[PDB]
Amino acid sequence: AVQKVVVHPLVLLSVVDHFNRIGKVGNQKRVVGVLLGSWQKKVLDVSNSFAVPFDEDDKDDSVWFLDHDYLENMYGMFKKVNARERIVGWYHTGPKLHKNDIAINELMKRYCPNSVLVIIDVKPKDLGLPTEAYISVEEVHDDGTPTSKTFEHVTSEIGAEEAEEVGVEHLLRDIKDTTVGTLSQRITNQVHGLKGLNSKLLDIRSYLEKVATGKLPINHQIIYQLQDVFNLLPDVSLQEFVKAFYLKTNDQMVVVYLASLIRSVVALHNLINNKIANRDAEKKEG
Amino acid sequence: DLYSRYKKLQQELEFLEVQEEYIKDEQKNLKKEFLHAQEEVKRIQSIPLVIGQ
Amino acid sequence: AVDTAEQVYISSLALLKMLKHGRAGVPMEVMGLMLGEFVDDYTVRVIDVFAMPQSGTGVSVEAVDPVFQAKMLDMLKQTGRPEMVVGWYHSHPGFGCWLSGVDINTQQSFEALSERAVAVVVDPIQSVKGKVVIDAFRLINANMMVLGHEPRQTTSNLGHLNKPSIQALIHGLNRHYYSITINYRKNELEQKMLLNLHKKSWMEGLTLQDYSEHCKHNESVVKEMLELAKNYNKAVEEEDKMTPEQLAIKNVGKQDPKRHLEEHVDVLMTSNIVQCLAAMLDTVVFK
Amino acid sequence: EEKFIVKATNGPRYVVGCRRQLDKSKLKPGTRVALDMTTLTIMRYLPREVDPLV
Ligand SMILES: [Zn+2]
Numbered sequence: 001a002v003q004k005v006v007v008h009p010l011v012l013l014s015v016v017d018h019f020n021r022i023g024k025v026g027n028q029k030r031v032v033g034v035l036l037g038s039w040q041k042k043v044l045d046v047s048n049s050f051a052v053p054f055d056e057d058d059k060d061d062s063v064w065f066l067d068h069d070y071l072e073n074m075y076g077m078f079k080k081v082n083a084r085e086r087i088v089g090w091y092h093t094g095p096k097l098h099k100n101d102i103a104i105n106e107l108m109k110r111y112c113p114n115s116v117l118v119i120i121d122v123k124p125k126d127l128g129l130p131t132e133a134y135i136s137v138e139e140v141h142d143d144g145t146p147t148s149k150t151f152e153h154v155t156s157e158i159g160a161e162e163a164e165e166v167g168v169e170h171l172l173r174d175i176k177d178t179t180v181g182t183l184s185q186r187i188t189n190q191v192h193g194l195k196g197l198n199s200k201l202l203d204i205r206s207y208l209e210k211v212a213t214g215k216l217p218i219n220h221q222i223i224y225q226l227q228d229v230f231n232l233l234p235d236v237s238l239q240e241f242v243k244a245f246y247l248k249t250n251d252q253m254v255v256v257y258l259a260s261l262i263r264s265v266v267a268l269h270n271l272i273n274n275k276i277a278n279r280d281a282e283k284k285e286g
Numbered sequence: 287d288l289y290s291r292y293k294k295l296q297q298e299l300e301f302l303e304v305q306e307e308y309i310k311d312e313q314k315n316l317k318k319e320f321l322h323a324q325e326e327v328k329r330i331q332s333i334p335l336v337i338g339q
Numbered sequence: 340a341v342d343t344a345e346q347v348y349i350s351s352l353a354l355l356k357m358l359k360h361g362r363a364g365v366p367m368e369v370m371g372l373m374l375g376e377f378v379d380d381y382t383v384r385v386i387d388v389f390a391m392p393q394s395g396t397g398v399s400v401e402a403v404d405p406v407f408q409a410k411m412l413d414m415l416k417q418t419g420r421p422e423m424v425v426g427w428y429h430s431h432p433g434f435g436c437w438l439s440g441v442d443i444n445t446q447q448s449f450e451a452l453s454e455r456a457v458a459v460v461v462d463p464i465q466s467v468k469g470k471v472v473i474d475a476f477r478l479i480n481a482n483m484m485v486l487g488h489e490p491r492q493t494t495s496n497l498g499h500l501n502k503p504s505i506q507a508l509i510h511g512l513n514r515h516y517y518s519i520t521i522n523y524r525k526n527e528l529e530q531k532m533l534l535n536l537h538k539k540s541w542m543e544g545l546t547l548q549d550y551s552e553h554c555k556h557n558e559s560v561v562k563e564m565l566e567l568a569k570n571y572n573k574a575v576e577e578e579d580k581m582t583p584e585q586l587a588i589k590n591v592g593k594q595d596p597k598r599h600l601e602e603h604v605d606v607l608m609t610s611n612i613v614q615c616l617a618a619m620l621d622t623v624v625f626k
Numbered sequence: 627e628e629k630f631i632v633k634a635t636n637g638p639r640y641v642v643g644c645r646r647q648l649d650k651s652k653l654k655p656g657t658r659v660a661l662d663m664t665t666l667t668i669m670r671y672l673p674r675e676v677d678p679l680v
Binding site for chain 3: 009010012013016017019020021022023047048051053070073074077080081082124127128129130155157158159160161162163164165166167168170171172174175178180181182185186188189192193195196199238241244247248249251252254255258259262263265266269272276
């Protein structure tokens with residue numbers, strides 16, 4: 001149904017507010033906020049959101065506390081001031097997906113339309129993208145397990161339309177723009193290996209752990225496609241790609257001729273002014 | 287004075303040597319600021335505009 | 340009779356709420372309320388900022404519904420927002436950020452409770468996207484016309500308050516109407532969450548997806564940009580063939596504002612993408 | 627092909643861009659279109675007709 005979503009940083013800075021207005025009480029649980037957006041178009045666009053007092057139990061996980069009057073009053077006043085945005089779903093700040101999320105999401109599945117779920121981290125130490133759109137749809141399983149709520153990952157992007165780019169750029173004054181060239185390219189080409197190294201290294205350890213020490217079926221069926229796609233590149237002998245290395249290396253030669261020739265053109269004004277300026281300033285100095 | 291010029295001059299050796307990485311920092315940072323302000327004054331020029339004579 | 344040097348603390352909450360409220364800043368007059376806590380005399384901090392529904396009357400004391408204001412404030416009191424109102428904001432599109440008689444009258448009526456009564460006017464309509472410089476307004480006492488206008492100490496920040504130096508509004512209407520300085524604040528959670536959030540907003544999902552796209556587009560699409568780049572290079576070299584004649588005749592003074600050097604340097608920078616991504620293809624092919 | 631010149635009824639002329647939703651079919655010149663006050667975007671076009679042709 002929905003291919004991609006658009007999440008503005010305003011809601012995540014509202015999660016920064018979720019971490020600001022705590023008051024140093026010692027709970028810092030998965031505070032659930034009421035996510036708002038535009039479900040009209042096929043693409044999802046989050047503009048702003050708000051929160052609702054949400055408290056769980058220490059031992060029992062099935063305890064969840066929501067509010068209908070606060071949702072209808074905040075949504076009623078927010079719709080009165082801005083009727084272009086309506087309820088879409090919710091989101092929790094907890095890093096782990098608990099079992100009670102089917103009951104928490106089920107309320108906004110009954111009263112509200114199909115709600116999207118977003119799992120983020122309480123500490124911004126994760127290098128990866130903090131936002132993951134998880135659609136709440138029921139899928140048929142091939143093994144015969146009963147139909148249950150399934151959270152499929154929907155791709156997400158963090159973009160701002162008109163003003164939030166200007167506000168973020170003014171508040172930071174440290175981040176740089178695209179700036180194609182040497183630095184913005186070589187930084188990605190340096191740290192990209194760590195950007196994949198922390199992800200893959202962080203995933204395959206618990207993966208290999210759950211291979212031998214795993215039960216409660218984790219959908220082993222998708223592991224066959226996992227190792228299949230991993231074995232779709234069986235160390236090609238590079239025999240056919242030699243001519244492609246001749247093509248890319250020939251373009252490299254083109255960059256060599258462009259650099260040497262163009263820089264040789266740049267040497268004109270320098271290697272002329274260095275003489276005509278020094279000898280004339282010297283002969284005319286005294 | 288004759289032999290003291292060596293060790294006294296070493297302080298000038300260090301004071302002039304310390305400026306190398308400093309001018310490296312200035313020449314590597316002020317051009318980053320040059321492209322920052324350059325793109326900042328470049329992005330002011332927007333396509334929607336009025337045409338005069 | 341005493342005055343200090345006050346400064347308005349502006350976080351990203353009120354800023355982004357004034358940016359979404361500026362996107363909703365239609366020509367019709369809008370209303371808003373600022374909240375916060377008063378810790379001492381010469382400091383003021385804003386935390387909570389929301390919008391108000393529009394009305395046909397516009398900015399006025401009659402449009403402010405006390406049961407709606409107190410209702411939403413009470414709903415903020417039952418939640419984790421124990422902050423009292425500190426001021427009200429609005430938008431003045433087109434005719435400038437100055438305040439009319441109605442605005443100064445509802446400001447005079449709304450300043451009876453809070454002695455500070457911070458007033459902010461956002462106007463992103465005619466302001467370019469390069470700067471988001473915003474200014475906070477204040478109300479002066481009418482009985483201070485005999486004595487000095489603003490006996491504010493620490494006159495250093497007035498140089499930073501001199502950035503809005505429009506020659507009609509500031510000193511064109513500065514009588515009985517002055518302003519105050521604005522500073523910001525950012526903790527480590529906003530710095531790392533918003534910084535990594537913006538870097539990720541300019542980065543990819545797995546960060547390895549769109550690299551090979553350009554690494555392999557260098558052979559398909561960039562070749563056209565390389566041929567056209569050489570067409571501009573030769574298109575300048577055809578004049579650089581004529582340059583050594585003038586440079587061989589006059590050698591005195593410069594009449595052409597074109598440098599012919601930095602543009603070719605930029606062409607070399609765009610041409611170095613092949614070199615920088617060749618090692619990327621070497622890594623993808625290797626492992 | 628992406629950004630062209632518009633001629634307003636009031637007399638002053640402007641230049642606008644292309645919206646990601648519409649295509650280059652109706653974007654060809656000679657067709658009266660509509661603009662927006664903010665960002666000068668294009669929502670849809672305006673088909674001509676005689677005041678009297680209706
Ligand atoms: Zn007005």
